Amino acid sequence: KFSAKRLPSTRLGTFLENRVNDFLRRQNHPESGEVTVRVVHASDKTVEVKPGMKARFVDSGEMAESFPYRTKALFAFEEIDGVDLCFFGMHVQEYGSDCPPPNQRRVYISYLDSVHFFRPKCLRTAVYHEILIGYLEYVKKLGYTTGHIWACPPSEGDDYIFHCHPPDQKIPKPKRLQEWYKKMLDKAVSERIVHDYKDIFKQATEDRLTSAKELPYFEGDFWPNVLEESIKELEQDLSQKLYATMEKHKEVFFVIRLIAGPAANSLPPIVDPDPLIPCDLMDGRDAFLTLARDRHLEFSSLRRAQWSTGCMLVELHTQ
Numbered sequence: 001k002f003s004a005k006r007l008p009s010t011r012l013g014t015f016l017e018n019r020v021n022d023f024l025r026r027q028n029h030p031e032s033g034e035v036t037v038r039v040v041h042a043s044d045k046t047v048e049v050k051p052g053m054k055a056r057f058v059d060s061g062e063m064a065e066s067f068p069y070r071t072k073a074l075f076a077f078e079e080i081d082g083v084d085l086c087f088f089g090m091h092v093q094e095y096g097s098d099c100p101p102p103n104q105r106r107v108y109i110s111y112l113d114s115v116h117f118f119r120p121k122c123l124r125t126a127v128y129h130e131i132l133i134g135y136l137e138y139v140k141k142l143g144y145t146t147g148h149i150w151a152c153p154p155s156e157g158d159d160y161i162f163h164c165h166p167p168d169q170k171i172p173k174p175k176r177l178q179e180w181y182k183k184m185l186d187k188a189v190s191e192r193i194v195h196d197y198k199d200i201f202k203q204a205t206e207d208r209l210t211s212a213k214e215l216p217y218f219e220g221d222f223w224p225n226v227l228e229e230s231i232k233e234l235e236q237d238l239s240q241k242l243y244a245t246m247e248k249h250k251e252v253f254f255v256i257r258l259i260a261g262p263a264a265n266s267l268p269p270i271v272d273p274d275p276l277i278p279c280d281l282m283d284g285r286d287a288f289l290t291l292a293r294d295r296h297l298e299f300s301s302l303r304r305a306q307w308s309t310g311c312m313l314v315e316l317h318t319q
């Protein structure tokens with residue numbers, strides 16, 4: 001069988017799928033199936049500071065030229081009608097203890113997606129909370145202090161991970177997206193997994209950030225681009241432009257404090273218990289979108305998403 005269960009295990013993957021399956025066991029719903037969480041890619045990368053910011057702070061020695069991180073691609077599958085369905089995919093960026101500031105001990109949830117066929121429908125949000133909250137708890141135990149989430153609102157026909165979304169899987173508005181993550185984070189705050197969370201604007205204000213070299217620099221994030229455009233415009237201060245852009249989009253950006261204050265200062269180095277997992281199909285989101293486009297693998301209906309997950313799984317086992 002080329003099932004998701006037969007894909008190599010990881011500490012992270014089995015920690016997450018245990019959290020989901022314990023939850024589903026307690027619910028004891030007849031429509032629910034066994035869930036599989038697999039880390040299908042893990043590789044070391046670096047994000048280079050862009051020219052505008054490089055000239056302003058890197059050439060003057062005020063900021064690092066590049067920040068090293070580990071990128072992981074984790075997928076969740078559920079058994080529906082005897083076959084696996086991939087219903088959740090996430091690409092993360094992890095900036096460890098050997099990363100120069102302002103990026104050290106930070107995790108960035110770059111782009112996230114899902115296919116709304118999780119059965120039963122009533123347990124869908126709860127299962128996503130187990131996955132996201134479970135990931136925050138996991139990295140918090142390894143020594144990561146902060147979590148960052150850009151809830152980038154999608155647009156019709158724009159897929160982040162899964163090619164051809166169901167026509168009725170609706171595109172949430174920024175207000176809806178902010179509300180979902182607020183409810184999710186409020187749940188982690190009450191379970192004592194998260195210390196507290198704030199929007200990016202409230203966060204920069206209460207951290208007393210005065211320079212753009214203090215803002216964490218993430219691969220593909222909105223803020224490395226805002227900074228380039230702000231500098232370019234100012235060539236025709238940077239800090240007031242940054243605070244203005246943060247005020248306008250604060251509802252989409254979350255900063256999540258996992259390890260707060262005193263505990264955060266006496267921390268040992270971050271050591272990942274799992275090995276690196278090469279997989280060029282999951283090296284970023286474009287490889288799997290490209291493959292699904294060329295091979296006509298759609299996730300627009302339940303059976304189409306089940307057939308696509310099957311092809312996806314034989315590609316993952318073949319490497």
Ligand SMILES: CNC(=O)Cn1cc(-c2ccc3c(c2)[C@H](F)C[C@]32NC(=O)N(CC(=O)N(Cc3ccc(F)cc3)[C@@H](C)C(F)(F)F)C2=O)cn1
Nearest residue numbers: 113114128154156157158159160165166167169172177180
């Ligand atoms: C006319 N038809 C067409 O255009 C068909 N068509 C539809 C799309 C389309 C739809 C959805 C999405 C995308 C494209 C993007 F890839 C990303 C996205 N996928 C995804 O899961 N979200 C998060 C989301 O929706 N959450 C939050 C959430 C969910 C899971 C999770 F683990 C953490 C958070 C909800 C529960 C919310 F209600 F809270 F918002 C996306 O926004 C493209 N085409």
